[PDB]
Amino acid sequence: KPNEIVITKSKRIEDYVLDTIILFNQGYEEVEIRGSGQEINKAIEVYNQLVDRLKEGVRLEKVDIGSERISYILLRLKRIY
Amino acid sequence: PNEIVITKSKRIEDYVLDTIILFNQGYEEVEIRGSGQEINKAIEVYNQLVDRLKEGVRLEKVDIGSEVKDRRRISYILLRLKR
């Protein structure tokens, strides 16, 4: 659960990127990022900024989409050393 | 033609109608692309196709990323749906 992030309106994209890299740095090899509704685009932009930084060092392990009546996306990312 | 790009003008139900008609016309797989704001919209099109077609439609592939469109950087989602 500490490597499970929910994207909300509260923080900037860049804050969630830093949150994710800190979790990776702390030894969680995988982090889940969840976004729903208007924050699906935000979650994808968090992923894009992570890839921009880490390149091969991060891998998109799994993408789930669905409804929970609002849409959601769930991304599983893996740090690779 | 079976490569749909979601915009702000059309409603979700028109894209749903669009996809089902492509399915019946012989396009077994339809691609739905949404960028930036319309990522959430594209997923909603998918969810309604599921809500009406149930197991008659399968999510084959989901791509996410960023790219440059009309010289602005945008996030995108690409959904490939199979009938």
Domains and CATH numbers, chain A: 4-79 (3.30.110.20)
Resolution, expressed in angstroms to one decimal? 1.7
Between the alpha carbon of residue A79 and those of residues A29, A47, A50, B44, B62, the distances in Å are: 5, 12, 10, 30, 21
Structural biology method used: X-ray
Torsions phi, psi of B20, nearest 5?
-60, -40
φ/ψ (deg, to 5) at B71: 60, 15
Amino acid at A6: V
Q: Taking the CB of residue A24, how many other CB atoms lie within 10 A of it?
A: 22
d(CA B60, CA A54): 27
Residue B43: list chain A partners with CB under 8 A: 40, 65, 71, 73
Closest approach of A79 to chain B, Cα-based (Å): 17
Contact A45 B66 (CB under 8 A): yes
Helix and strand numbers (H, E) in chain A are: 2, 4
Helix (H) or strand (E) run with residue A63 in it: strand A58-67
CB B44 within 8 A of CB A38: no
